[PDB]
Design a protein around this ligand. Structure first.
Ligand SMILES: Nc1nc2c(ncn2[C@@H]2O[C@@H](COP(=O)(O)O)[C@@H](O)[C@H]2O)c(=O)[nH]1
Length: 182
């Protein structure tokens, strides 16, 4: 059986370069391909970038328990979520699976698939994360204040996760995740 790992973290502790490292380091890693009810953009491939389905199908899948998690996107412009079947079929074939989702999606997946390992990718310190949120200072005080507030709420509940990987350095955070996946 392949391990299923669910990778989450703060709304912006930066996860896309970590994900890219992982897919580079594990040759046959299955990166979960989400279902969505929005339209393809040019260059998006059905089955690779998303499984493109229609609102009616999506509701059918919700009703039959075929989603590990789903959410309304942009206040309900459309819907996205993680399909259960590809994840289970890949693991049964022996391929390792990575699901990358926001904290609400990680929380939902632990209920629908308890044997998934949940990983919270933590910053090496508060000041490290705060520096990154202030960034180039091109946002207003109110926006920055909201980001810092959001970040502390999210940080406060990393305890709910099976594992905390501290992102001290790309290579060792990536190494820790490889060890979990294979
Ligand atoms: N809950 C959930 N949200 C997703 C999923 N896939 C993408 N999203 C959310 O919707 C996305 C919008 O990205 P886009 O539509 O530009 O690919 C991101 O904000 C992402 O957090 C998913 O599988 N489940």
């Amino acid at each position: 059986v392949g391990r299923v790992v669910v990778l989450s973290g703060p709304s912006a502790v930066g996860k896309s370069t970590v994900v890219r490292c992982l897919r580079e380091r594990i040759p046959n890693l299955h990166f979960s391909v989400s279902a969505t009810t929005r339209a393809p953009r040019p260059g998006e491939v059905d089955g690779v970038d998303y499984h493109f389905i229609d609102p009616t199908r999506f509701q059918q899948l919700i009703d039959q328990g075929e989603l590990l998690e789903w959410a309304e996107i942009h206040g309900g412009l459309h819907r996205s979520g993680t399909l259960a079947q590809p994840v289970r079929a890949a693991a049964a074939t022996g391929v390792p699976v990575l699901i990358e989702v926001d904290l609400a999606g990680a929380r939902a997946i632990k209920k629908t698939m308890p044997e998934a390992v949940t990983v919270f990718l933590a910053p090496p310190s508060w000041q490290d994360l705060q520096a990154r949120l202030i960034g180039r200072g091109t946002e207003t005080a109110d926006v920055i204040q909201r980001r810092l507030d959001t970040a502390r709420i999210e940080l406060a509940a990393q305890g709910d996760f099976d594992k905390v990987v501290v992102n001290r350095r790309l290579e060792s955070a990536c190494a820790e995740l490889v060890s979990l996946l294979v």
